[PDB]
Each structure stands twice: as C-alpha cells, then as structure tokens.
Design a binder for this molecule. Structure first.
Ligand code: HEM
Ligand SMILES: CC(C)(C)OC(=O)NCCCCCC(=O)NCc1cccnc1
Length: 460
C-alpha cells in the first residue's frame, strides 16, 4: 500500500492496519485521536484514513506556509470527500481555478459594507427569538438551546439569503422550513463515510448512480424554489440570492445552477454551525454566572434601557468579543483544517510528497498546555486587549486562515453577537434539571454535546 510512506520519511505516527489505516483509532472521535497523537508524537506525525496518508502539523510557521504562503501553488484544495453531484460546484468543495473564480465571484457578498444592511433583517429575528424565549421563561419550562437557537439560525438564513420570513420555531410544518431543517452537517465517522474512506474506489460508482450525500429531495425543493424565485418577481432587497444574481450582470459568468449550489452551501454552512456555537456559549455563560453578569453589564452600558443593537455598537463590545472568542477556543467546531498537497514540496525543513493531506488539528492546538494556561478552563480574559497579543493566529484558528479561510466569518460573528445581545438584555440563564456538568462532547464526527444543552431561562 502507501502504508510505508511515513516510515520511509522518518515521520512518526500510529502504525496502520491493512485496508483500515488508522480509522479504528477514531472510536473516541477525531479530537481525542488528535490530542493523543500530539502528546505522543510531538510536532509532526502521520496516519492513514484507509489508504490516504495524512500529515498532522503543529508548527505555526509551517501552518502559515500551508494556509497562507503556498495556498495557490501547492495547498489549494480540501480532501474530496464523497459522492457529491452538482454540489461539486459549491465553493467549499470546488478546486483550483474553479474555486478561485467562485471565491472572487462571492467575495463581495461578504464585505463589511453589505453586512451592515443585513443587520436590520437579522436584528428582526433577535426580537422574534426573545418572545419565543419569554413564552418559555414565563412558564419556567427548561429550554432546549439547540432548538430555539436552531430556529433563530434558520430564520436568519432564510431571510438573509432568500427573503423568506418565517418564525420556524412556530412554523415547523411549512414546506420551506421543514427539510430546510435540513442538511445537518456530515458525521464523517458514521458508517457510510467510514465505508467510503476504506473504499474510496466506490465513490465514482455512487456518483454514476446519482447517489449524493446531499439529500436530493431537499436539493430539489430548493433548486426549484430559487428558480421560481426568479420570475423575476422584481419584474430592492439585500439578501444573498440577489447579491448573487445582481452579480450575474456587469473571469466571472456565474452559472445559475452554480448559484443554487452556493445557496445550498451557505445554509449547510451557517445553520448548524451558528446554533451549535450559540449553544456552547450559553452553556459557558450559565455555568459561569460572573461572566454572564459582566457581559450583561457591558451590554447595558453600551445599549442602555435595552437599546437595539447596531452594527457599530456590536463591534464596540469587547467582553462580548472575548466571550465569543474563548468559546470558539474550547469548541472549534471545524475541528481540523485540511489541504491536499498538489506537488512534491519542501516546506520549513520538511519534504511533503504529492497527494498527502496536510492537516492542522485546531481542536488539539486550542487545548495545548504550551500555548494555553490551564487549557480546559473557560477564561475569557485570555482575549483581553492585554493578553491578546500573546496568541498565535496559527495556533488559534476557529475560522481557518489564508485565502481559503471561512468566507462567512464576519457574518457568523455578527449574527451570533446580535442574537446574544438581544437575549442577554432580557434573560439570565441558569443550570438546571438536565444540565450535564461538566458538558460531555459526543464521540461521533461532530463537535457537539453528547446530550443537548438545556437550561432555565429567567426574565430580567
Ligand atoms: C461559528 C460559525 C462558523 C465557523 C466556526 C466556521 C468555521 C469555518 C472553518 C474553520 C472553515 C475552514 C477554513 C479553512 O479551511 O481554513 C470554514 C470554511 C467555510 N465557511 Fe465557515 N464557519 C462558520 C460559519 C459560516 C457561515 C455563516 C458561512 C456562510 C454564510 C460559512 C461559509 C463557509 C464557506 C463557504 C467555507 C469554505 C470557504 C472556501 O473554501 O473558499 N461559514 N468555516
Ligand atoms: C462543510 C463545508 C461546507 C464543506 O465547509 C468546510 O469545508 N468547512 C469545514 C468542514 C468541517 C466539517 C465539520 C463542521 O462542523 N463544519 C463546519 C463548517 C461547515 C460549513 C461552513 N463553515 C463551517
């Protein structure tokens, strides 16, 4: 096999089994595998997903080279991951020049400029979220964050991308909202993906049969919805769809299905991500009352008598930013960053052969006792103006880095912050019947709690 590769390069790592590579070692999940390999093998190690070699790197200089310096030349693409269909055109899945084009075509849709006019729309569902909370606060019902935050994230997506304005929490049976509750992110350690990892030679077989990891039911509904959405009815708005089709006017030439694929990927991208992070944040706040109180104190100072948050007031809130950042340190939901090596290359004193997947293990790096004092504790002061400088931007990578980092980063931060401001203005959050303390991470392929976070909401 290719199983002698790392032994031949003098690169250490877990010894692999025939066919399986090292995938049995994922029985405790990616992040714990990554943590242990790091503690056992040091700064660089290798393992095999089936026959695919994967080189883990932890040196910031080396991480910078891969993510920033040699992105266009060598490390342009992610690992191809399964039968994908037309979604091959989605920006996050596209490769080389097709990616570079789509990235350029879609960049203007993520400038601070037009993010600001997205704010009132998002904001509108800040208030929606509140009443839904108030209804469950007044009746002292312990609250499923994942649900209420899930619905909020949906609402913000529907409206910001297509103009569909639905309180999804109380409209769960609406054609749009229902399996546009969707695309949930892929458990790459579930049996289907474990199998394609061992038999990647079966992927073209699935492709030919038009089998797709993206449910074609959901994909159908949307492609048509978008289509319909282009009568064109306008025959203003400031959503993603129109920011996307108004770019089809005036290199370039964004196809109309390609466009659909991006619409799909933006949901898949920002639905479960936003709501998962928002839940992890509320969990930390409830289990750290002083931090929650400080945050509410900051919010009431910037926005007196419960003032409506604005673009500029959001950015003004420093403790908020620290609380969001520190939650992302503990729970970097992407878990690893990856690029495929396109050419034989020697970087920072190490030769890396063509075809290796270079992997940066963000979860393991975010909790490395070398860059982080008492790494398991939730300590927002890590990110204060004072201590912020001692943080390496290639150790701390919740949104990746370089030309291929999270394109939706500014929007996600703004989104979450708006929601957290509006929520914290009206409620205090407290541990409860359920509350798994400490929180227990799932052993699956997703960075999420084992049991869903539930908390009491009390009206201020
Ligand atoms: C808390 C929320 C989010 C987190 C933590 C997050 C994190 C990440 C990370 C770590 C990457 C990989 C970057 C890399 O490989 O260097 C990524 C990629 C990406 N994200 Fe996000 N993301 C979030 C929300 C969103 C949202 C709201 C959108 C879109 C509206 C989005 C769209 C994308 C896209 C399109 C990519 C692939 C970019 C490319 O390949 O060109 N993400 N994200
Ligand atoms: C998942 C797609 C859309 C392919 O984007 C990425 O490659 N991002 C990181 C993949 C890690 C999978 C686990 C995961 O939870 N995804 C995080 C995510 C998803 C979409 C956008 N932003 C962040």
């Amino acid at each position: 096999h290719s199983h002698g590769l790392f032994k031949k390069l003098g690169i250490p790592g877990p010894t692999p089994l025939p066919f399986l590579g090292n995938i049995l070692s994922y029985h405790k999940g990616f992040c714990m595998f990554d943590m242990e390999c790091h503690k056992k093998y040091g700064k660089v190690w290798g393992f095999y997903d089936g026959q695919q070699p994967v080189l883990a790197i932890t040196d910031p200089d080396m991480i910078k080279t891969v993510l920033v310096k040699e992105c266009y030349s060598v490390f342009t693409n992610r690992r191809p991951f399964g039968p994908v269909g037309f979604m091959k055109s989605a920006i996050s899945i596209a490769e080389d020049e097709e990616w570079k084009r789509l990235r350029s075509l879609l960049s203007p849709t993520f400038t601070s400029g037009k993010l600001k006019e997205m704010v009132p729309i998002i904001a509108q569902y800040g208030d929606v979220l509140v009443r839904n909370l108030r209804r469950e606060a007044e009746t002292g019902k312990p609250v499923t964050l994942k649900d209420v935050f899930g619905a909020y994230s949906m609402d913000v997506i529907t409206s910001t991308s297509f103009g569909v304005n639905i309180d999804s929490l109380n409209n769960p049976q609406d054609p749009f909202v229902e399996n546009t509750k969707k695309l949930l992110r892929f458990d790459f350690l579930d049996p289907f993906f474990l199998s394609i990892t061992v038999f990647p030679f079966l992927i073209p077989i699935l492709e030919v049969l038009n089998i797709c990891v993206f449910p074609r039911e959901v994909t159908n509904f949307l492609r048509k919805s978008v289509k319909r959405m282009k009568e064109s009815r306008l025959e203003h708005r400031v959503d993603f769809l129109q920011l996307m089709i108004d770019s089809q006017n005036s290199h370039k030439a964004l196809s109309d299905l390609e466009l659909v694929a991006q619409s799909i990927i933006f949901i898949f991208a920002g639905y479960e991500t936003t709501s998962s992070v928002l839940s992890f944040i509320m969990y930390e706040l409830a289990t750290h009352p002083d931090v929650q109180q400080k945050l509410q104190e900051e919010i009431d100072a910037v926005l007196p008598n419960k003032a409506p948050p604005t673009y500029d007031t959001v950015l003004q809130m420093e403790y908020l930013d620290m609380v969001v950042n520190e939650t992302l340190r503990l729970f970097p939901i992407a878990m690893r960053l990856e690029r495929v090596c396109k050419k034989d290359v020697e970087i920072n004193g190490m030769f890396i052969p063509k075809g290796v997947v270079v992997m940066i293990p963000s979860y393991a790096l975010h909790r490395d006792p070398k860059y982080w004092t008492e790494p398991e504790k939730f300590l927002p002061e890590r990110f204060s103006k004072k201590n912020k400088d001692n943080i390496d931007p290639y150790i701390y990578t919740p949104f990746g880095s370089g030309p291929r980092n999270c394109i939706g980063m500014r929007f996600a931060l703004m989104n979450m912050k708006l929601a957290l401001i509006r929520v914290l203005q009206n409620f205090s959050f407290k541990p409860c019947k359920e509350t798994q303390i400490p929180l227990k991470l799932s052993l699956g392929g997703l960075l999420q709690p084992e049991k869903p976070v539930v908390l009491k909401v009390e009206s201020r």
